[PDB]
Amino acid sequence: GNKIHPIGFRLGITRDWESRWYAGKKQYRHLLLEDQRIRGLLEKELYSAGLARVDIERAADNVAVTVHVAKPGVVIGRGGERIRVLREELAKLTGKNVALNVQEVQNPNLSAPLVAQRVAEQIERRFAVRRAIKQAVQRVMESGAKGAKVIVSGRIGGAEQARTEWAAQGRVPLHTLRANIDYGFALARTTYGVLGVKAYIFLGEVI
Amino acid sequence: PEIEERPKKEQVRLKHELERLQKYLSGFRLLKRLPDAIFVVDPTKEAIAVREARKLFIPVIALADTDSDPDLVDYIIPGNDDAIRSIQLILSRAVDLIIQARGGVVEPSPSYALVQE
Amino acid sequence: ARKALIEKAKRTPKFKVRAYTRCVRCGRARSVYRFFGLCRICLRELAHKGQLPGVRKASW
RNA sequence: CGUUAAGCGCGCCGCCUGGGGAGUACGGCCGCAAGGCUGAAACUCAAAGGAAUUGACGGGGGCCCGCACAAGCGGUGGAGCAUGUGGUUUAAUUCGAAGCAACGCGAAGAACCUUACCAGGCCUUGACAUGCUAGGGAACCCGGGUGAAAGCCUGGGGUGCCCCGCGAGGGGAGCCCUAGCACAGGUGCUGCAUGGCCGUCGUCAGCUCGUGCCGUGAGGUGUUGGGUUAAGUCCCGCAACGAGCGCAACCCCCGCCGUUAGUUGCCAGCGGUUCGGCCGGGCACUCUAACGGGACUGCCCGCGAAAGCGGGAGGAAGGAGGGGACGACGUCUGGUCAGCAUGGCCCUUACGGCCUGGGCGACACACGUGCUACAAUGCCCACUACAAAGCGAUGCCACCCGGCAACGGGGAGCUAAUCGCAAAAAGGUGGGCCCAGUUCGGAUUGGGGUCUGCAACCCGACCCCAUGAAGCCGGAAUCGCUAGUAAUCGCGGAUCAGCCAUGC
RNA sequence: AAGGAGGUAAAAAUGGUAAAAAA
Secondary structure, X not given: OOOOOOHXXXXXXXXXXXXXXXXXXXXXXXXXXXXXXXXXXXXXXXOOOOOXXXXXXXXXXXXXXXXXXXXXXXXXXXXXXXXXXXXXXHHHOOOOOOOOOOOOOOOOOOOHHHHHHHHHHXXXXXXXXXXXHHHHHHHHHOOOOOEEEEEEEOOOOOOOOOOEEEEEEEOOOOOOOOOOEEEEEEEEEEOOEEEEEEEEXXXXXXX | OOOOOXXXXXXXXXXXXXXXXXXXXXXXXXXXXXXXXXXXXXXXXHHHHHHHHHXXXXXXXXXXXXXXXXXXXXXXXXXXOOOHHHHHHHHHHHHHHHOOOOOOOOOOOOOOOXXXX | OOHHHHHHHOOXXXXXXXXOOOOOOOOOOOOOEXXXXXXXXXXHHHHHOOOOOOOOOOOX
């Protein structure tokens, strides 16, 4: 039925807040408002190289953003003439001191948001669902993971019946904690509908 | 020192399974490679055994009483299986026989107490 | 109507008593927990998706 | 199937050759008749079949569990009020949800706002963004007519900047105006095109992988067998041995102890005192809130092959310690396009947009969840008691005062363990009522008051005093609940001008 | 009794849901 965000349950010692800044009772709103706007217009632009996490810090002008990209290469631009315009606008609609920090994660086939990103985008480019996606779960357990699952729900190929085609390989202990799982859902848009791409990836015990 | 570390009931069930493999794989814990032939007692039960061996092309020695077929075995021994003393004679003999291929001739000792009491 | 409605209050009219809260991450007035300036479904989508500090998937 | 062969062989007879047409047509023999025996075709479909496997299903059954019943304590139905609802109706009474899984449900604050509904006034390159053609205005500060208001016709100001200027000027940009355009927009339909998100079966114990073995194989196995548990929990068996998601565990609240720590607490221990933690002092105790330890059938005894059970203790803690989040594989085309996105269909000076009104609260009934009750284990007035949690800056609001009060005028402290919301109430301790439509119960009713808000008619809460209905403890039926649970009693927060909150 | 089994028993007030069609 539900499943609930592993995330919205991993906020113990397994998922530390995406946005780390204390707030005043009154303040809270407008702060998060500008915040979600940052992530927002960032999303439209700095997608180009897989935007996973978006680490946020705020003390008092301390607008530190640690954009976990996927590969900041052809995204910082030559000499940083693209990091420039982004920090620029960042300042344009943030009445304080901005930060960029392109902290991409070492490895691709980890952190399910970008996994599912490529996943849904393959269907976005019409491609073979079960074939290339089984190849995706494949690639995950071909990277060194411990359990990969990709649910893809919606109008495959049209045909009224919106199935929920599902594939998996490796253990996915969702009721556990220490085990740690990364969850990421891509919002797949068929030219003819909206199908939901979703992925869980397992890591391991002890941590 | 996995003692003070890890929960106590964890130890408990691990002790249970400990004696699972202990009791059930008592003798067998060195049975390596293909064990040449079988030997085995009342040929029926240990013809679930002889079945698996019969497939493995592991020559069948085993010991037989009146009811169970002989031909499924390649090296058959007729005689009683009922009483302790049957396999006492036959096995003890067999054992200081394989150890006749060895050396020791240690006094034939076991059974005798439980042989009737 | 919808689009015009958010604009109706977004610009404060005549009387103080004609303002009504607005989920700026979904767009409604019903059950918008003013503390966050977020509706209830917008609330849960934010807190769940990890994009909300101070909270806790409470278990008290 | 297997010495009663459906086994290995031999003799002989009848009989088979797609399902359907059909054991029917015609013909021959037959019978009192009913009918038989014999026995085809055209045409028509591309399948009809036999077993055996999986699973849904079943008005078959066996075992299993549960407030299912039993066993007890209090209730809904009975009356008045609240809200939800059918129906009913109006110009509109705006939609959604429908046995359980809709009915105090979206709605966690509908007077106009909200608002999607109606009558009317009116705008429409549109309240919103996006860019071009050709034109003008600098942005932009005020005002008059008009009107219910949006809208509408004008009037005072006004002339910041780039280039070329002690001169004249134009073009260019934010910048608004008008035509034209590309467009916006639509809570219009479509959840039977969808995502996501909840429901729900259901914390029900279920769904499977691996090598091996059985089966020509589909596949079975493992997972069917017995005792046991909340449990596919564990043991025993056992052609299997195990392994993963489920159950559990790792997570939090709550109970015992500790170490850090002392503006909460205190003579607990000392001094004094305005004897009131009030003045110094101190960390002992509460507390606070952190980092661990502590419980595993670990110990003791009797039973069972073990899994477990009985009895006893050590201990704050027994046999899962109490709770909470936690909810699989899957079904159900559940619910939702009126939170959002959303494929499509669709109106585009009207299904778009503003305003003012009116409805969402209507009434010949019906229904679910509810508050109160109908009374002496009680109602009433006086004195004292112990709460826990959650709040409070343009808010919390102690205090005197005016007011019987509603609340109003002057007024302290307060970014809070230090200030206030705030009186917990039942308990207890005195006095009244004397069994009565009662000092019961306030349902409703009139002449007046307070508060918020532009505004309280529809349609607000709250105050006064006069009114004081039904109600004598509820038939069929039907609900809750297994321990600090039920029953009883008070308290806060959410969103909110206010408040319909008896709701959550 | 532990089972499989051969003969004799008990056991259902009610109903219509269409179907072009997905993996």
